[PDB]
């Protein structure tokens, strides 16, 4: 079990760690989060009490180093940093635990939610979507735009998701215009799975990361990417059986975990109604279809 200490909490802020979140008052003595489960990625995120705009946060994996949070009064936000001095860092953490100034990552043992949301997400892949190669952790916020959004402005700050576009030469073989547009199997399996992502796990990893960014920061371009990657599978007639079963489980926990009050903007009516009811794979998302109807039948 690992720890992310906080130097201090100088401004009132709601802090999240994965799907949990705590309200911290200005200069309340908060000094970090302990008992964070080893073995998965994690994300710590922030929304200031005064600017309910710009949710921002950091993706990290505690196996890749010792990380802490410190408020910067010039840039006006909680920054994640790495402590290279191993001794200096257990000293900080152990003193803060002794004084009991840390929240415990509050994982119920029956609960596989976070595992299920992050099953295919790997820190090394995140750091290629968010290129800042001098840090081991990755910053994301509400406003960052994707490489695809840009093409239609600052590239250092972009989300470099894989571009998917159903009306492109990449997606459409010359001579199979009608075939490939109506059945995206060649775009999914040859171009994307075999060609770019290499395997289904990396594909699912990007899909899950896009969802989480949409959920935790309301990043709209991530929401577009998550929907695009679902639609590409559901609009393919020929999908490996293991992918369809795993897709149903992935989407199930994503829909399960969404705040009920956010189904209006995070969920795209056309994509979901086509996936669940009109697509080749309409009958292959039994668990996802069942929870969508019982929770957001309006959308449908």
């Amino acid at each position: 079990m690992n720890t992310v200490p906080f130097t201090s909490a100088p401004i009132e802020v709601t802090i999240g760690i994965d799907q949990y979140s705590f309200n911290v008052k200005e200069n309340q003595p908060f000094h970090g989060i302990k008992d964070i489960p080893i073995g998965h990625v994690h994300v710590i995120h922030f929304q200031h009490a005064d600017n309910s705009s710009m949710r921002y946060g950091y993706w990290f994996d505690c196996r890749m180093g010792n990380f802490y949070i410190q408020y910067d009064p010039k840039d006006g936000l909680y920054k994640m940093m790495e402590e290279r001095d191993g001794a200096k860092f257990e000293n900080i953490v152990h003193n803060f635990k002794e004084r009991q100034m840390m929240v415990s990552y509050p994982k119920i043992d029956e609960d596989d939610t976070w595992y299920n949301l992050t099953e295919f997400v790997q820190m090394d892949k995140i750091r290629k979507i968010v290129r800042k190669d001098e840090n081991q952790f990755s910053y994301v916020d509400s406003s960052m735009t994707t490489v695809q959004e840009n093409e239609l402005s600052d590239p250092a700050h972009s989300l470099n998701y894989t571009v998917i576009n159903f009306k492109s030469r990449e997606a459409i073989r010359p001579g199979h215009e009608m075939e490939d547009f109506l059945d995206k199997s060649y775009y999914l399996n040859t171009v994307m799975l075999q060609g770019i992502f290499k395997n289904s796990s990396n594909y699912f990893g990007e899909l899950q990361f896009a969802f989480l960014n949409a959920m935790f920061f309301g990043n709209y371009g991530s929401s577009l990417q998550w929907h695009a990657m679902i639609e590409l599978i559901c609009s393919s007639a020929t999908v490996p059986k293991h992918m369809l079963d795993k897709l149903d489980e992935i989407l199930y926990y994503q829909i399960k975990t969404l705040p009920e009050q956010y189904s209006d903007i995070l969920l795209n009516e056309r994509v979901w109604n086509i996936c669940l009811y009109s697509s080749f794979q309409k009958n292959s998302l039994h668990n996802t279809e069942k929870i969508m109807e019982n929770k957001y039948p309006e959308l449908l």
Partner: protein, 237 residues
């Protein structure tokens, strides 16, 4: 964006554009089978591709053989239309290729877009106008060449005959759409007006009769009256 009443004069500027109408690509008669079921038989069709500024018509004849052993024909017809339009563009020299293609039916946008991916600087546009180009097979010479075809064939016409020697494109297109609107609303009457006078003939290289300027005014008035009448009968006004 979409073409409509507001940007209507853009049709007659010097940017090459083509209308494409697919209504007559897939044509069927519906009949009863010996067992009482219903079946369709296809007849020859055509794509109606028209330069509204010059009158040049690219009439691509769709022979019934293209449908043989195919499913979801009404869907296939849109992709065949888009295939053939894209082939036409590729066949034209660069300086004759259109800068825009306006499809008369919105269902053609995606198939044409996908077939034109090689021509990213050609804009594919819908239209809000209710254009009468489905009545093209009410023009006797066009109907005749479609029905007689025994194989795929491109036949070229000037849909304005020689009108442009005396009138502008704007007026020529207005004449054409009025004639086609009338043929569409009551073909029998419309055709009666055009031929009632045996002394006004259709040149061998023309589609419409050789009316003088004055006779065209009488004609256009007769066609307007025809259209208005049908409307009160349709709706009871």
């Amino acid at each position: 964006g979409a073409m409509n009443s507001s940007n209507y004069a853009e049709l007659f500027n010097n940017d090459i554009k083509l209308f494409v109408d697919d209504t007559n690509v897939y044509r069927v008669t519906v009949h009863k089978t010996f067992e009482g079921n219903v079946a369709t038989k296809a007849i020859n069709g055509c794509i109606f591709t028209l330069n509204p500024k010059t009158g040049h018509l690219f009439l691509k004849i769709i022979h019934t053989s293209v449908w043989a052993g195919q499913k979801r024909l009404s869907q296939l017809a849109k992709w065949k239309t888009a295939e053939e339009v894209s082939a036409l563009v590729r066949s034209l020299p660069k300086e004759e290729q259109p800068k825009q293609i306006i499809v008369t039916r919105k269902a053609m946008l995606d198939p044409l877009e996908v077939h034109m991916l090689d021509f990213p600087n050609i804009a594919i546009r819908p239209t809000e106008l209710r254009l009468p180009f489905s009545a093209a097979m009410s023009i006797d010479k066009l109907s005749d060449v479609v029905m007689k075809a025994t194989e795929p064939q491109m036949v070229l016409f000037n849909i304005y005959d020689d009108w442009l020697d005396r009138i502008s494109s704007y007026t020529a297109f207005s004449r054409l759409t009025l004639l086609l609107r009338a043929l569409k609303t009551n073909e029998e009457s419309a055709k009666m007006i055009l031929l009632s006078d045996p002394t006004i003939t259709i040149k061998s290289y023309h589609l419409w009769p050789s009316f003088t300027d004055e006779q065209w005014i009488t004609i256009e008035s007769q066609m307007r009256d025809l259209i208005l009448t049908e409307y009160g009968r349709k709706y009871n006004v």
